[PDB]
Amino acid sequence: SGVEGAAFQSRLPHDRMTSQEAACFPDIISGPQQTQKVFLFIRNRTLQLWLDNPKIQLTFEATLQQLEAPYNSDTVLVHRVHSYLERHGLINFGIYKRIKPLPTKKTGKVIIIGSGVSGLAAARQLQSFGMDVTLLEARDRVGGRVATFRKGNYVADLGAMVVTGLGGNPMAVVSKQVNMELAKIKQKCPLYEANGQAVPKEKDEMVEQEFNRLLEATSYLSHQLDFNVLNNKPVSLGQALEVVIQLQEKHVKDEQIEHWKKIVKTQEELKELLNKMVNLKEKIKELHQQYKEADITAEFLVKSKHRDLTALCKEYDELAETQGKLEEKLQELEANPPSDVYLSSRDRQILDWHFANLEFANATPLSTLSLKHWDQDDDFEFTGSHLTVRNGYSCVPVALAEGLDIKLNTAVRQVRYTASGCEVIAVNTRSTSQTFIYKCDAVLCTLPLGVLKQQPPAVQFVPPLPEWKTSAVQRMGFGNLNKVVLCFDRVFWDPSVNLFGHVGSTTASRGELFLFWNLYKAPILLALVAGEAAGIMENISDDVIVGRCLAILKGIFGSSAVPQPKETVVSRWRADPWARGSYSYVAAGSSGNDYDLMAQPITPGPPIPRLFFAGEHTIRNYPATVHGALLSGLREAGRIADQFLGA
Ligand SMILES: [C]C1=C([C])[C]=C2C(=[C]1)N([C][C]([O])[C]([O])[C]([O])[C]OP([O])(=O)OP([O])(=O)O[C][C]1O[C](N3[C]=NC4=C3N=[C]N=C4[N])[C]([O])[C]1[O])C1=NC(=O)[N]C(=O)C1=N2[C]([C][C]=O)C1=C(O[C]C2=C(F)N=[C][C]=[C]2)C(F)=[C]C(F)=[C]1
């Protein structure tokens, strides 16, 4: 349905109040049920009005005007609901035409560190709420871990580049507002072995289905058997994977043993049986000789010796009958061996390709992920097909930047917060002699976790952060993932496939250039560097890594089919001081709860909060994503406005 659809699109149950709404509307939860149903219709219809046309601000007046009777009659309640939705960024978020121009007198000074999606989303909220917002951004550009390369006809994203399902996804709103050109991804993904030979379909399917099996098995180990701590250490996904593969190999070796025992037993029965038939031939040779030696006792001696001879001959023909049913059991046993090994060398390499795919998805080696919690956010996936931003994901943050007071090339070095306000200190990256001091009432820190982890610190906090926050920083994972962009003047690959795989030759290097993407109008290929390879490869010059790309591609399509690229780009997210990695992951020994601790504001001791946190690493249910970063900016904007303008 329509207004039910709007609730779903807002990640809300269409037919009950959230706890958050119960808090803000206690008169509703404690009042009659009829009024609670009225409340929910107001909420859903208001969201529909916004979502049907997110390019313009949805005001209270226009909501009241578009409500049908009797709902447009409870004016006070309509306003209460509108105000709540707006404050929490469920309407009038993103970029839209303001009907009410911005208030000319501001209220409170907020410094936002970082002009990524989380910083931009919060800034637009706080500016709409009437506050004085200034963003300090170290790079010469907005977008942070959204980073679009453009040169000639080439456009390619070096950071984020995929919108997961639009159903429930706030990026669906931003897409409509900004005009992102999105394009659904075709799912076919052929694999090529390291010699460039295609992986046959049967081997592709066999290994993939086994991959699914192994992983489901780790999840049974974890969440049914509670195999989560071992020898006083938290178990990693990689560790569990090594364990379940070891058990499959044990099982294979056992069925092999059982089968060899069956072989041996059959051979032994034949040896014995042949010895017995041997002696029975010898016994018949003796009776057959006493049959030619042959009176009344002679006429009866032949009858008796024929009775004896042909009785031994029946013993012998019946034993050659067993001889046949046995060497017939033997022949098919030698012809039906169970698998010699669990994974052929090629089978193992292909399986390592699927592992690399998972290390791509989590941006970190599997041996680092928490076995128990690495996919704790699975239950929050959006519905619908995934898409890529054909026109470059920077269109989103660039659009969000319009009208904001953003100081680029401005690197924060120190953040001071007291019960009397805050001071942020920064340097000009083009002239690190030039220094700036920003006084403010509140700081919103959207520095990446990688920057927060940096030792010695890039940014110094005064007073230092509390142990519960720094130890959460210490526990959490911050991964890495890199891309090689190859721009050609001609298309030599299969244009109808968005993906194809290169099966690495070894486990340790399974993530090197393992997956190629074909996603754009023009001839562009992205090659991914995942897992252990991701950090190590940053130490390779551009030209050499491109050469390795080209060698792979020449192996797949032929040496003369692959021309020299006209333009190349190589991400190095770990070495980037403004990222120091790509995005968080749930490290073994961490959990979603660390994401909640990351979101928690700091209050200087006896008082009111001064230092706030946003970014993909602060949102438990949507970490490591653009929409999660976005939502986190909206969340903190609500928290800060509640503090400085009143709930
Ligand atoms: C890196 C990366 C990559 C490479 C990729 C990707 C990513 C990443 N992702 C993630 C995102 O992006 C995130 O989450 C966001 O971005 C966040 O944001 P924030 O929070 O805001 O942060 P930033 O941005 O960084 O910001 C901050 C700021 O700050 C600053 N600074 C620093 N330092 C300093 C400063 N300032 C001042 N001072 C100082 N000192 C900086 O600069 C900044 O600005 C993503 N996401 C999403 O959503 N999507 C996508 O797509 C993405 N990605 C990926 C990964 C994984 O896997 C993904 C995917 O994949 C896709 C693909 C690719 F990429 N390629 C090819 C093919 C495919 C998927 F599918 C999904 C997902 F989910 C993800």
XYZ file of C-alpha atoms and ligand atoms in Angstrom:
721
model
C 0.000 0.000 0.000
C 0.827 3.754 -0.302
C 1.182 5.263 3.179
C 2.292 1.875 4.419
C 4.920 2.039 1.705
C 6.033 5.389 3.045
C 6.611 3.934 6.504
C 8.596 1.048 5.059
C 10.614 3.527 3.013
C 11.436 5.312 6.264
C 12.647 2.120 7.993
C 9.657 2.225 10.319
C 6.944 -0.273 11.177
C 3.871 1.039 9.473
C 1.569 -0.273 12.210
C 3.237 0.499 15.548
C 5.172 3.257 17.297
C 8.893 2.954 17.810
C 10.359 3.245 21.267
C 11.761 6.596 20.202
C 8.245 7.774 19.300
C 6.896 6.368 22.550
C 9.420 8.541 24.400
C 8.473 11.676 22.516
C 4.692 10.964 22.628
C 3.950 9.411 26.039
C 0.441 10.828 26.028
C -0.192 8.702 22.952
C 1.084 5.400 24.370
C -0.842 5.927 27.585
C -4.012 7.242 25.909
C -6.822 5.423 24.125
C -5.943 3.090 21.263
C -8.012 5.058 18.764
C -5.762 8.094 19.125
C -2.675 5.922 18.650
C -4.071 4.738 15.321
C -4.711 8.373 14.391
C -1.102 9.217 15.277
C 0.251 6.509 13.017
C -1.809 7.667 10.059
C -0.547 11.227 10.497
C 3.049 9.957 10.551
C 2.732 7.697 7.521
C 0.897 10.241 5.396
C 3.423 12.950 6.269
C 6.254 10.727 5.154
C 4.372 9.991 1.934
C 3.904 13.663 1.193
C 7.639 14.206 1.579
C 8.754 11.076 -0.291
C 6.397 11.644 -3.227
C 8.234 14.925 -3.834
C 11.487 15.257 -1.892
C 12.779 18.093 -4.068
C 10.943 20.764 -2.082
C 10.604 21.342 1.640
C 7.479 19.853 3.189
C 6.177 22.441 5.625
C 3.656 22.019 8.394
C 1.136 24.151 6.541
C 1.382 22.061 3.380
C 1.033 18.865 5.365
C -2.087 20.191 7.017
C -3.376 21.263 3.625
C -2.871 17.833 2.067
C -4.446 15.797 4.865
C -7.970 14.545 4.216
C -10.708 14.992 6.795
C -10.764 14.209 9.774
C -7.009 14.182 9.945
C -6.545 17.769 8.834
C -8.658 18.735 11.879
C -6.314 17.719 14.747
C -3.959 20.618 14.060
C -1.969 20.374 17.294
C -1.209 16.711 16.788
C -0.304 17.251 13.141
C 2.214 19.871 14.177
C 3.634 17.660 16.926
C 4.171 14.873 14.418
C 5.582 17.135 11.711
C 8.028 18.665 14.181
C 9.198 15.295 15.361
C 9.754 13.936 11.861
C 11.628 17.057 10.792
C 13.871 17.113 13.868
C 14.891 13.507 13.335
C 15.633 14.045 9.626
C 12.854 11.808 8.408
C 11.527 14.662 6.275
C 13.317 17.748 4.955
C 16.689 16.031 4.756
C 19.147 16.037 1.877
C 19.014 18.945 -0.589
C 15.713 20.643 -1.400
C 14.215 24.035 -2.172
C 13.511 25.825 1.085
C 10.092 27.461 1.326
C 10.897 29.205 4.585
C 14.260 30.948 3.914
C 17.039 30.403 6.398
C 16.700 32.279 9.698
C 18.882 35.323 9.565
C 19.807 35.212 13.273
C 21.606 31.958 14.170
C 21.697 29.990 17.449
C 24.823 28.132 18.590
C 28.132 27.622 16.766
C 28.954 24.092 15.590
C 32.242 23.050 14.024
C 31.974 19.954 11.892
C 35.237 18.137 11.340
C 35.127 16.555 7.924
C 33.107 17.159 4.790
C 32.218 13.560 3.960
C 28.622 12.416 3.641
C 28.156 12.327 7.383
C 29.531 15.838 7.877
C 27.591 17.247 4.920
C 24.291 15.671 6.025
C 24.643 17.031 9.523
C 25.627 20.468 8.229
C 22.556 20.754 6.045
C 20.351 19.738 8.959
C 21.944 22.131 11.441
C 21.796 24.957 8.879
C 18.099 24.271 8.343
C 17.609 24.310 12.124
C 19.054 27.818 12.189
C 22.573 27.253 13.525
C 25.976 28.638 12.508
C 27.839 25.713 10.949
C 31.346 25.621 9.587
C 33.005 22.531 8.168
C 36.769 22.032 8.436
C 37.965 19.651 5.710
C 41.565 18.564 5.205
C 41.270 17.594 1.538
C 40.988 19.998 -1.392
C 37.538 18.580 -2.045
C 34.317 17.465 -0.392
C 33.014 13.887 -0.308
C 35.687 12.153 1.785
C 35.432 8.433 1.078
C 33.194 9.324 -1.841
C 35.798 10.106 -4.476
C 35.099 10.412 -8.221
C 37.875 10.599 -10.826
C 37.124 12.571 -14.076
C 39.448 13.076 -17.034
C 38.390 13.218 -20.693
C 35.295 11.081 -21.199
C 36.273 8.981 -18.230
C 34.330 9.005 -14.931
C 35.108 6.436 -12.185
C 34.560 6.213 -8.414
C 37.654 5.409 -6.313
C 35.742 5.155 -3.009
C 32.051 4.393 -2.578
C 30.184 3.636 -5.803
C 27.225 1.308 -5.048
C 23.756 2.016 -3.742
C 22.398 -1.139 -2.098
C 18.626 -1.621 -2.369
C 16.424 1.479 -2.738
C 13.663 0.084 -0.536
C 14.088 1.786 2.834
C 17.280 3.464 1.678
C 17.559 7.232 2.336
C 19.842 7.390 -0.657
C 16.683 6.796 -2.713
C 15.590 10.271 -1.632
C 18.970 11.785 -2.284
C 19.003 10.191 -5.758
C 15.705 11.846 -6.628
C 16.944 15.194 -5.241
C 20.381 15.156 -6.889
C 19.650 13.281 -10.148
C 22.049 10.466 -9.689
C 22.061 8.232 -12.745
C 21.748 4.788 -11.213
C 22.160 1.529 -13.094
C 21.245 -1.981 -11.876
C 24.113 -4.526 -11.840
C 23.835 -7.711 -13.936
C 24.668 -10.706 -11.778
C 26.647 -12.940 -14.161
C 30.307 -13.084 -13.056
C 32.589 -15.432 -15.011
C 35.779 -16.643 -13.403
C 39.096 -17.136 -15.171
C 41.887 -19.222 -13.795
C 45.327 -17.696 -13.431
C 46.287 -19.010 -16.866
C 43.333 -17.077 -18.296
C 41.309 -20.232 -18.963
C 37.650 -19.869 -18.064
C 36.428 -21.710 -15.025
C 33.966 -24.342 -16.302
C 30.386 -23.935 -15.105
C 30.354 -27.167 -13.146
C 33.496 -26.296 -11.212
C 32.171 -22.749 -10.658
C 28.916 -24.105 -9.234
C 30.479 -26.916 -7.228
C 32.901 -24.596 -5.491
C 30.321 -21.862 -4.901
C 27.810 -24.249 -3.346
C 30.539 -25.644 -1.110
C 31.483 -22.057 -0.161
C 27.900 -21.440 0.906
C 27.994 -24.674 2.916
C 31.245 -23.902 4.740
C 30.048 -20.446 5.716
C 26.664 -21.609 6.945
C 28.628 -24.132 9.002
C 30.664 -21.442 10.730
C 27.437 -19.671 11.562
C 26.042 -22.918 13.116
C 29.256 -23.316 15.112
C 28.935 -19.747 16.335
C 25.231 -19.266 16.947
C 24.067 -22.765 17.816
C 27.124 -24.340 19.499
C 28.526 -21.108 21.096
C 32.034 -21.807 19.866
C 33.078 -18.225 20.315
C 36.013 -18.206 22.743
C 38.964 -20.544 22.436
C 42.037 -20.760 24.644
C 40.968 -17.415 26.102
C 40.820 -15.821 22.622
C 37.827 -14.661 20.521
C 37.371 -16.826 17.437
C 37.746 -15.203 14.025
C 35.809 -16.070 10.926
C 39.090 -17.138 9.312
C 39.826 -19.437 12.225
C 36.397 -21.060 11.997
C 36.843 -21.460 8.255
C 40.149 -23.270 8.762
C 38.408 -25.555 11.238
C 35.487 -26.511 8.999
C 37.773 -27.151 6.046
C 39.937 -29.360 8.211
C 36.865 -31.421 9.080
C 35.849 -31.858 5.447
C 39.369 -33.045 4.678
C 39.214 -35.469 7.618
C 35.876 -36.816 6.318
C 37.301 -37.350 2.843
C 40.315 -39.148 4.231
C 38.000 -41.370 6.310
C 35.768 -42.437 3.446
C 38.982 -43.124 1.570
C 40.184 -45.297 4.439
C 36.869 -47.158 4.661
C 37.073 -47.735 0.935
C 40.661 -49.013 1.057
C 39.644 -51.361 3.897
C 36.856 -52.726 1.688
C 39.432 -53.243 -1.062
C 41.878 -55.042 1.219
C 39.202 -57.280 2.717
C 38.048 -58.292 -0.769
C 41.612 -59.035 -1.873
C 42.144 -61.152 1.234
C 38.962 -63.120 0.570
C 40.116 -63.793 -2.965
C 43.606 -64.909 -1.873
C 42.096 -67.355 0.627
C 39.451 -68.523 -1.841
C 42.007 -69.172 -4.560
C 44.119 -71.161 -2.124
C 41.030 -73.194 -1.274
C 40.092 -73.750 -4.936
C 43.724 -74.735 -5.547
C 43.551 -77.464 -2.938
C 40.152 -78.583 -4.254
C 41.552 -78.930 -7.786
C 44.360 -80.978 -6.242
C 41.709 -83.082 -4.384
C 39.793 -83.607 -7.623
C 43.001 -84.491 -9.473
C 43.434 -87.258 -6.879
C 39.907 -88.599 -7.182
C 39.912 -88.297 -10.979
C 43.074 -90.446 -10.906
C 41.440 -93.132 -8.698
C 38.540 -93.153 -11.237
C 40.676 -94.761 -13.989
C 41.855 -97.517 -11.629
C 38.329 -98.811 -12.245
C 33.572 -107.563 -10.536
C 30.639 -106.415 -8.352
C 32.612 -104.205 -5.965
C 33.983 -102.572 -9.174
C 30.601 -101.945 -10.814
C 29.696 -100.330 -7.475
C 33.139 -98.689 -7.182
C 32.544 -96.677 -10.339
C 29.110 -95.528 -9.132
C 30.669 -94.443 -5.825
C 33.717 -92.783 -7.384
C 31.486 -90.948 -9.859
C 29.324 -89.864 -6.942
C 32.437 -88.636 -5.153
C 34.064 -86.984 -8.199
C 30.995 -85.095 -9.225
C 30.384 -84.027 -5.633
C 33.805 -82.380 -5.449
C 33.088 -80.897 -8.907
C 29.883 -79.366 -7.518
C 31.870 -77.960 -4.609
C 34.285 -76.427 -7.125
C 31.727 -74.990 -9.546
C 29.905 -73.418 -6.590
C 33.152 -71.937 -5.300
C 33.905 -70.401 -8.714
C 30.372 -68.963 -8.409
C 31.447 -67.170 -5.268
C 34.724 -66.332 -7.023
C 32.737 -64.407 -9.595
C 30.400 -62.561 -7.217
C 33.537 -61.452 -5.334
C 35.803 -60.310 -8.157
C 32.686 -58.536 -9.378
C 32.442 -56.777 -6.009
C 36.165 -55.919 -6.422
C 35.956 -54.556 -9.942
C 33.339 -51.903 -9.197
C 35.054 -51.043 -5.922
C 38.266 -50.199 -7.807
C 36.106 -48.271 -10.291
C 34.168 -46.147 -7.702
C 36.724 -44.492 -5.343
C 35.452 -41.611 -3.209
C 37.176 -38.291 -3.719
C 40.915 -38.539 -3.281
C 41.000 -34.992 -1.798
C 38.490 -32.473 -0.552
C 39.658 -29.702 -2.873
C 41.758 -30.125 -5.950
C 44.509 -27.541 -6.249
C 42.358 -25.705 -8.786
C 39.244 -26.232 -6.668
C 41.067 -24.699 -3.714
C 42.199 -21.665 -5.707
C 38.631 -21.019 -6.885
C 37.389 -21.315 -3.308
C 40.029 -18.752 -2.342
C 38.440 -16.513 -4.934
C 35.163 -16.641 -3.031
C 37.027 -15.899 0.195
C 38.653 -12.909 -1.476
C 35.171 -11.749 -2.506
C 34.195 -11.808 1.144
C 37.399 -9.936 2.145
C 36.452 -7.343 -0.449
C 32.984 -7.030 1.095
C 34.351 -6.602 4.625
C 37.566 -4.784 3.594
C 39.756 -6.964 5.864
C 41.304 -10.447 6.105
C 38.807 -13.068 7.323
C 41.115 -13.952 10.171
C 40.277 -10.519 11.629
C 36.471 -10.616 11.594
C 34.535 -11.499 14.724
C 33.043 -14.917 14.126
C 30.044 -14.204 16.330
C 29.229 -10.666 15.169
C 30.776 -9.979 11.722
C 27.354 -9.927 10.046
C 25.289 -8.548 12.947
C 23.815 -5.952 10.585
C 22.486 -8.499 8.085
C 18.919 -8.043 9.388
C 18.879 -4.410 8.124
C 19.545 -4.994 4.398
C 17.463 -2.934 1.993
C 15.184 -4.486 -0.573
C 15.626 -4.108 -4.306
C 18.465 -4.485 -6.730
C 21.838 -2.777 -6.165
C 22.945 0.008 -8.494
C 26.006 2.006 -9.439
C 26.204 5.723 -9.948
C 26.862 6.083 -13.638
C 27.499 9.811 -13.313
C 29.843 9.539 -10.330
C 28.978 9.379 -6.648
C 30.558 12.810 -6.016
C 27.376 14.262 -7.475
C 25.856 13.499 -4.080
C 28.316 15.300 -1.737
C 28.890 18.076 -4.267
C 25.173 18.738 -4.235
C 25.100 18.625 -0.460
C 27.914 21.209 -0.269
C 25.855 23.988 -1.907
C 25.701 26.994 0.383
C 27.654 25.525 3.281
C 30.484 27.362 5.010
C 33.184 24.859 4.141
C 36.893 25.538 4.658
C 38.865 23.077 2.506
C 42.615 22.419 2.861
C 41.980 22.932 6.565
C 43.374 20.089 8.649
C 42.269 19.812 12.301
C 45.218 19.058 14.608
C 43.667 19.621 18.072
C 40.177 19.602 19.558
C 39.614 21.297 22.924
C 36.304 20.948 24.758
C 35.365 22.192 28.218
C 32.136 22.850 30.090
C 32.438 26.400 28.669
C 32.678 25.555 24.938
C 35.159 24.241 22.394
C 38.183 25.277 20.350
C 39.286 23.502 17.169
C 42.791 24.214 15.876
C 43.731 23.632 12.210
C 46.509 24.244 9.699
C 46.518 25.138 6.025
C 47.705 22.039 4.147
C 49.231 24.252 1.430
C 51.099 26.274 4.072
C 51.224 24.393 7.407
C 52.598 27.572 8.972
C 49.150 29.194 8.631
C 47.095 28.301 11.752
C 43.400 28.761 12.620
C 41.473 28.736 15.946
C 37.694 28.128 15.796
C 35.651 28.739 18.933
C 32.298 27.010 19.086
C 29.643 25.613 21.349
C 29.857 22.135 19.919
C 32.128 19.947 17.837
C 30.816 17.181 15.613
C 33.693 14.817 14.859
C 33.262 12.853 11.627
C 36.952 11.906 11.422
C 37.244 8.322 10.060
C 37.981 5.555 12.558
C 41.296 5.070 10.747
C 42.247 8.633 11.649
C 41.070 8.067 15.236
C 43.266 4.978 15.435
C 46.376 6.790 14.259
C 49.393 6.557 16.571
C 50.954 8.907 17.146
C 47.600 10.769 16.826
C 46.851 13.007 13.871
C 44.250 14.883 15.929
C 44.848 15.559 19.648
C 41.935 15.792 22.094
C 41.897 18.120 25.114
C 41.124 16.667 27.593
C 41.968 13.193 26.156
C 39.009 10.985 25.300
C 37.619 8.638 28.014
C 38.827 5.061 28.259
C 35.459 3.689 27.187
C 35.720 5.641 23.958
C 39.397 5.073 23.186
C 39.145 1.371 23.970
C 36.165 1.173 21.650
C 38.371 2.843 19.024
C 41.091 0.323 19.775
C 38.774 -2.693 19.523
C 37.021 -1.857 16.267
C 38.292 -2.983 12.890
C 39.213 -0.529 10.134
C 39.853 -2.297 6.860
C 41.303 -1.505 3.472
C 40.367 -2.010 -0.143
C 41.808 -0.578 -3.303
C 40.977 -0.109 -6.969
C 42.895 0.126 -10.218
C 41.039 2.149 -12.852
C 41.887 1.319 -16.489
C 40.627 3.656 -19.241
C 40.993 2.347 -22.823
C 40.049 3.742 -26.206
C 38.308 0.499 -27.228
C 36.188 -2.175 -25.496
C 37.660 -5.699 -25.661
C 35.647 -7.434 -22.899
C 32.142 -8.813 -22.730
C 29.957 -5.695 -22.603
C 27.005 -7.603 -21.223
C 28.801 -8.663 -18.006
C 29.445 -6.191 -15.210
C 31.866 -8.540 -13.463
C 34.472 -11.087 -14.134
C 36.863 -12.859 -11.792
C 40.567 -13.688 -11.852
C 41.315 -16.710 -9.685
C 44.500 -16.045 -7.800
C 47.118 -18.736 -7.645
C 47.708 -18.765 -3.865
C 45.753 -18.351 -0.652
C 47.945 -15.592 0.758
C 47.604 -13.473 -2.431
C 44.031 -14.506 -3.235
C 42.854 -10.863 -3.120
C 45.218 -9.446 -5.790
C 43.301 -8.018 -8.742
C 40.717 -10.722 -8.258
C 37.586 -8.975 -9.587
C 37.092 -6.731 -12.612
C 34.143 -4.380 -13.025
C 32.628 -3.080 -16.249
C 29.997 -0.563 -15.258
C 30.056 2.475 -17.511
C 29.200 3.699 -21.006
C 32.886 4.288 -21.810
C 35.605 1.575 -21.725
C 36.499 1.450 -18.035
C 37.648 -1.453 -15.914
C 38.002 -1.486 -12.153
C 40.215 -4.160 -10.673
C 39.889 -4.758 -6.958
C 42.653 -5.375 -4.453
C 41.237 -7.038 -1.370
C 42.343 -8.703 1.842
C 46.012 -9.111 2.691
C 46.888 -7.754 -0.744
C 45.128 -4.435 -0.153
C 47.651 -2.917 2.216
C 50.706 -4.556 0.652
C 49.865 -3.437 -2.869
C 49.911 0.210 -1.847
C 53.698 -0.175 -1.959
C 53.596 -0.897 -5.727
C 53.996 1.830 -8.270
C 51.022 2.595 -10.505
C 52.753 1.449 -13.697
C 53.677 -1.982 -12.279
C 50.258 -2.772 -10.876
C 48.666 -1.685 -14.145
C 51.087 -4.023 -15.893
C 49.895 -6.882 -13.758
C 46.326 -5.964 -14.617
C 47.168 -5.927 -18.298
C 48.899 -9.279 -18.022
C 45.772 -10.817 -16.489
C 43.558 -9.282 -19.137
C 45.878 -10.403 -21.926
C 45.676 -13.891 -20.458
C 41.912 -13.807 -20.669
C 41.360 -12.119 -24.011
C 44.659 -12.496 -25.924
C 47.785 -10.319 -26.025
C 46.921 -8.429 -29.199
C 43.358 -7.721 -28.070
C 44.442 -5.603 -25.105
C 45.706 -2.118 -26.002
C 47.638 0.186 -23.762
C 45.309 2.167 -21.472
C 44.948 5.880 -22.189
C 44.430 6.774 -18.485
C 44.953 4.948 -15.154
C 44.236 5.645 -11.457
C 45.181 3.722 -8.314
C 43.616 4.162 -4.892
C 45.712 3.807 -1.774
C 43.142 4.171 0.977
C 45.348 2.967 3.825
C 48.170 5.445 3.059
C 45.705 8.281 2.645
C 46.174 10.252 5.891
C 42.584 11.486 5.708
C 41.281 7.907 5.650
C 44.078 5.602 6.897
C 41.926 2.732 5.563
C 38.569 2.221 3.807
C 35.811 1.533 6.388
C 35.188 -0.221 9.675
C 34.555 -3.926 10.278
C 33.623 -5.879 13.348
C 36.990 -7.090 14.581
C 37.214 -10.301 16.549
C 36.550 -9.258 20.121
C 34.403 -6.254 19.153
C 30.640 -6.089 18.593
C 27.818 -3.794 17.477
C 27.940 -2.377 20.944
C 31.243 -0.693 20.074
C 29.417 1.140 17.292
C 26.950 2.438 19.842
C 29.788 3.568 22.115
C 31.345 5.356 19.164
C 28.168 7.329 18.635
C 28.077 8.480 22.289
C 28.850 12.166 22.942
C 31.354 13.314 25.521
C 30.470 15.599 28.432
C 33.207 17.421 30.403
C 32.988 16.594 34.118
C 30.813 18.398 36.726
C 27.089 19.642 32.810
C 26.339 19.422 29.044
C 27.733 17.499 26.042
C 30.239 19.258 23.845
C 31.860 16.676 21.537
C 29.694 14.587 19.179
C 30.458 11.779 16.796
C 29.203 10.775 13.392
C 30.500 8.721 10.506
C 29.997 5.211 9.169
C 31.719 3.801 12.277
C 29.065 5.286 14.626
C 25.925 3.573 13.299
C 25.398 0.035 14.538
C 22.871 -1.102 11.963
C 24.374 0.394 8.826
C 28.151 0.615 9.285
C 30.646 0.964 6.438
C 28.129 2.530 4.004
C 27.224 5.899 2.534
C 23.654 5.643 3.754
C 24.909 4.707 7.212
C 27.223 7.708 7.262
C 24.295 9.821 6.082
C 21.899 8.533 8.709
C 24.561 9.104 11.344
C 24.827 12.737 10.320
C 21.045 13.043 10.579
C 21.091 11.332 13.972
C 23.694 13.707 15.402
C 21.989 16.750 13.952
C 18.890 15.724 15.865
C 20.863 15.128 19.046
C 22.649 18.471 18.857
C 19.494 20.467 18.031
C 17.664 18.782 20.887
C 20.466 19.876 23.183
C 20.862 23.496 21.949
C 17.312 24.447 20.922
C 15.278 22.127 23.165
C 13.333 18.894 22.819
C 36.964 3.646 0.711
C 35.732 2.902 0.263
C 35.745 2.189 -0.940
C 37.004 2.074 -1.757
C 34.579 1.578 -1.388
C 33.414 1.675 -0.648
C 33.390 2.402 0.538
C 34.558 2.987 1.004
N 32.148 2.569 1.181
C 32.061 3.231 2.482
C 31.470 4.637 2.486
O 32.080 5.496 1.513
C 31.585 5.234 3.888
O 30.749 4.472 4.757
C 31.242 6.726 3.921
O 32.035 7.390 2.935
C 31.507 7.338 5.281
O 31.640 8.771 5.202
P 32.078 9.612 6.441
O 31.589 8.857 7.646
O 31.676 11.007 6.437
O 33.664 9.569 6.375
P 34.481 10.303 5.232
O 33.761 10.201 3.948
O 35.930 9.829 5.254
O 34.505 11.735 5.864
C 35.368 12.247 6.895
C 36.066 13.462 6.350
O 37.074 13.910 7.283
C 38.136 14.433 6.514
N 39.319 14.554 7.354
C 40.211 13.558 7.661
N 41.151 13.923 8.497
C 40.873 15.254 8.754
C 39.752 15.665 8.043
N 39.232 16.907 8.013
C 39.933 17.745 8.789
N 41.010 17.485 9.542
C 41.514 16.225 9.551
N 42.589 15.963 10.311
C 38.259 13.470 5.343
O 39.009 14.006 4.258
C 36.776 13.259 5.004
O 36.336 14.235 4.065
C 31.014 2.339 0.434
N 29.812 2.644 0.997
C 28.634 2.493 0.323
O 27.559 2.771 0.836
N 28.722 2.010 -0.951
C 29.870 1.653 -1.621
O 29.826 1.348 -2.814
C 31.039 1.709 -0.792
N 32.209 1.035 -1.008
C 32.251 -0.430 -1.197
C 33.169 -1.191 -0.243
C 32.642 -2.542 0.153
O 32.539 -3.505 -0.559
C 30.921 -1.123 -0.975
C 30.478 -1.949 -2.011
O 31.356 -2.257 -3.043
C 31.061 -1.526 -4.246
C 32.067 -1.615 -5.364
C 33.214 -0.831 -5.464
F 33.432 0.075 -4.497
N 34.108 -0.828 -6.426
C 33.875 -1.678 -7.438
C 32.775 -2.505 -7.492
C 31.870 -2.474 -6.444
C 29.200 -2.474 -1.946
F 28.739 -3.141 -3.014
C 28.367 -2.282 -0.882
C 28.855 -1.524 0.143
F 28.051 -1.318 1.205
C 30.099 -0.943 0.139
